[PDB]
Design a protein around this motif. Structure first.
Motif, PDB file in Angstrom:
ATOM      1  N   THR A 180      -0.007 -10.004  -5.378  1.00 42.80           N
ATOM      2  CA  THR A 180       0.321  -8.972  -6.356  1.00 42.80           C
ATOM      3  C   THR A 180       0.654  -9.651  -7.677  1.00 42.80           C
ATOM      4  N   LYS A 181      -0.104  -9.318  -8.710  1.00 42.01           N
ATOM      5  CA  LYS A 181       0.170  -9.814 -10.046  1.00 42.01           C
ATOM      6  C   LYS A 181       0.547  -8.619 -10.943  1.00 42.01           C
ATOM      7  N   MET A 182       0.092  -8.627 -12.196  1.00 40.86           N
ATOM      8  CA  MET A 182       0.258  -7.486 -13.093  1.00 40.86           C
ATOM      9  C   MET A 182      -0.709  -6.366 -12.680  1.00 40.86           C
ATOM     10  N   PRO A 183      -0.338  -5.097 -12.937  1.00 41.40           N
ATOM     11  CA  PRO A 183      -1.099  -3.939 -12.435  1.00 41.40           C
ATOM     12  C   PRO A 183      -2.605  -3.935 -12.713  1.00 41.40           C
ATOM     13  N   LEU A 240     -13.454   4.872   5.390  1.00 43.46           N
ATOM     14  CA  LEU A 240     -12.229   5.089   4.613  1.00 43.46           C
ATOM     15  C   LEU A 240     -11.682   3.770   4.089  1.00 43.46           C
ATOM     16  N   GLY A 241     -11.098   3.812   2.893  1.00 39.72           N
ATOM     17  CA  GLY A 241     -10.393   2.659   2.334  1.00 39.72           C
ATOM     18  C   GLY A 241      -8.878   2.813   2.444  1.00 39.72           C
ATOM     19  N   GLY A 242      -8.185   1.694   2.615  1.00 42.45           N
ATOM     20  CA  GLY A 242      -6.732   1.677   2.619  1.00 42.45           C
ATOM     21  C   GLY A 242      -6.193   0.596   1.710  1.00 42.45           C
ATOM     22  N   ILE A 243      -5.148   0.931   0.968  1.00 48.16           N
ATOM     23  CA  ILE A 243      -4.449  -0.035   0.138  1.00 48.16           C
ATOM     24  C   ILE A 243      -2.984  -0.031   0.556  1.00 48.16           C
ATOM     25  N   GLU A 244      -2.507  -1.161   1.060  1.00 48.14           N
ATOM     26  CA  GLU A 244      -1.079  -1.340   1.264  1.00 48.14           C
ATOM     27  C   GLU A 244      -0.577  -2.238   0.150  1.00 48.14           C
ATOM     28  N   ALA A 245       0.098  -1.606  -0.804  1.00 48.61           N
ATOM     29  CA  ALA A 245       0.560  -2.260  -2.021  1.00 48.61           C
ATOM     30  C   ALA A 245       1.971  -2.773  -1.805  1.00 48.61           C
ATOM     31  N   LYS A 294       2.127  -9.113  -1.997  1.00 48.78           N
ATOM     32  CA  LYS A 294       0.668  -9.051  -1.848  1.00 48.78           C
ATOM     33  C   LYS A 294       0.155  -7.624  -1.694  1.00 48.78           C
ATOM     34  N   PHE A 295      -1.130  -7.455  -1.994  1.00 52.54           N
ATOM     35  CA  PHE A 295      -1.884  -6.272  -1.643  1.00 52.54           C
ATOM     36  C   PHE A 295      -2.757  -6.599  -0.436  1.00 52.54           C
TER      37      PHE A 295
END
Ligand SMILES: [Pt+2]
Ligand SMILES: [Pt+2]
Ligand SMILES: [Zn+2]
Length: 295
Positions: free
Chosen positions: A32-35, A3-8, A12-13
C-alpha cells in the motif's frame, strides 16, 4: 461469471479474481502506497480479466452508509492521502461494473458466514487480531451497520492488575487494541510475537485480554459463533487461555453450552484460514452484481 476482490490494508493490498462460490482463480498483492498509484495497480491487474463485478473490503473507519455523499471513502487514517480519498467511486469509474463495499472485517465475516465456521447460522462475529483489532458482525443474515460500522477493537477492557504497559492506541491508550494488538504485545515484551512463542505469560495475558473483550461482545451482541483471525491468533496457544477465561469472567450468568462445555466449538479459528477476508470480497462482488440486476 468472474468476480474481482480487493482487500485494502494499511500495509498491503490483495486483489483476487474468483467465483461466487468462493473459489480463488488468481491473486496478486502489492505494498500500500499513496492512493493514486496503489489504485492504478489494482486497475492494471483487473484489466487482464473480464469481470462481472468487484468487491472492496477496506481498512477504516470508512463511510459505509450507502446513502451518504462520502459513501465508500476512508474517514479516518494517519496514512498519507487516504482519508477522504474517493476509493469506491474511483474503482466504479475505472471498471464500469457493479462495485460492492464494506470494511475488511465485514468481508471476512461474510466469508465465514457463507463458506466457513458460521455456514448454516444466521449470526456470527469475526474478529481480527494483528496490527490492529477490528470486528464484523452478521445479525439475522445481514452485516451489522448502525450509525457506523462497529469499531469493537477500541472498547475499554479491565487492565490486568500485574500489567504495567500503558497502551499502543493513539486515541485511547489502553483500549482492547492498545493492550492486545500485535504492536502492543511487541512494545510490552520487547520482542516480536514469534520470539515470544515460548513465554507462556505473554499468551496468558493476551488470552485474558481477548476473553474480557469476548464477554462484552457476548453480553451485548450474543453472536452464535465467534471467529478469531489475524496474525496474533497464529499463536494457537492463546485459544486455550480464552477457553479457560471466558467462563470465569461470566461466572455462569448465561446458561448455554457455547459458553461453557462446548466453548472450544464456539470461539474458533476461521475455516477459510487467512483467506476469509479476500473470499468475502467476492461475496461483496456477487451481492453488488445481484443488487444491480434487480435495479
Ligand atoms: Pt501522494
Ligand atoms: Pt476492471
Ligand atoms: Zn483505541
Amino acid at each position: 461469471a468472474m468476480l474481482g476482490g480487493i482487500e485494502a490494508g494499511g500495509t498491503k493490498f490483495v486483489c483476487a479474481v474468483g467465483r461466487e462460490d468462493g473459489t480463488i482463480i488468481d491473486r496478486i498483492e502489492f505494498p500500500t502506497k499513496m492512493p493514486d498509484e496503489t489504485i492504478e495497480k489494482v486497475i492494471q491487474y483487473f484489466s487482464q480479466f473480464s469481470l462481472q463485478a468487484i468487491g472492496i473490503g477496506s481498512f477504516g473507519p470508512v463511510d459505509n452508509d450507502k446513502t451518504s455523499q462520502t459513501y465508500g471513502t476512508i474517514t479516518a487514517t494517519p496514512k498519507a492521502g487516504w482519508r477522504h480519498y474517493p476509493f469506491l467511486q474511483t474503482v466504479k469509474n475505472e471498471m464500469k461494473i457493479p462495485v460492492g463495499f464494506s470494511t475488511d472485517v465485514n468481508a471476512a465475516a461474510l466469508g465465514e458466514f457463507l463458506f466457513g465456521e458460521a455456514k448454516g447460522l444466521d449470526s456470527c462475529l469475526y474478529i481480527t487480531i494483528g496490527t490492529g483489532i477490528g470486528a464484523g458482525a452478521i445479525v439475522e443474515g445481514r452485516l451489522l451497520q448502525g450509525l457506523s460500522h462497529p469499531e469493537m477493537g477500541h472498547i475499554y477492557i479491565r487492565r490486568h492488575p500485574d500489567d504495567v504497559y500503558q497502551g499502543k492506541c493513539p486515541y485511547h491508550g489502553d483500549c482492547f487494541e492498545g493492550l492486545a494488538s500485535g504492536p502492543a504485545i511487541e512494545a510490552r515484551w520487547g520482542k516480536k510475537a514469534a520470539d515470544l512463542s515460548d513465554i507462556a505469560q505473554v499468551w496468558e495475558l493476551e488470552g485474558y485480554y481477548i476473553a474480557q473483550a469476548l464477554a462484552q461482545y457476548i453480553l451485548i451482541l450474543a453472536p452464535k459463533k465467534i471467529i478469531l483471525g489475524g496474525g496474533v491468533m497464529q499463536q494457537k496457544q492463546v485459544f486455550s487461555y480464552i477457553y479457560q477465561y471466558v467462563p470465569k469472567i461470566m461466572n455462569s450468568y448465561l446458561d448455554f453450552s457455547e459458553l461453557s462445555d462446548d466453548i472450544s466449538d464456539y470461539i474458533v479459528p476461521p475455516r477459510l484460514g487467512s483467506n476469509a477476508g479476500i473470499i468475502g470480497t467476492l461475496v461483496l462482488a456477487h451481492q453488488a452484481l445481484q443488487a444491480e440486476a434487480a435495479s
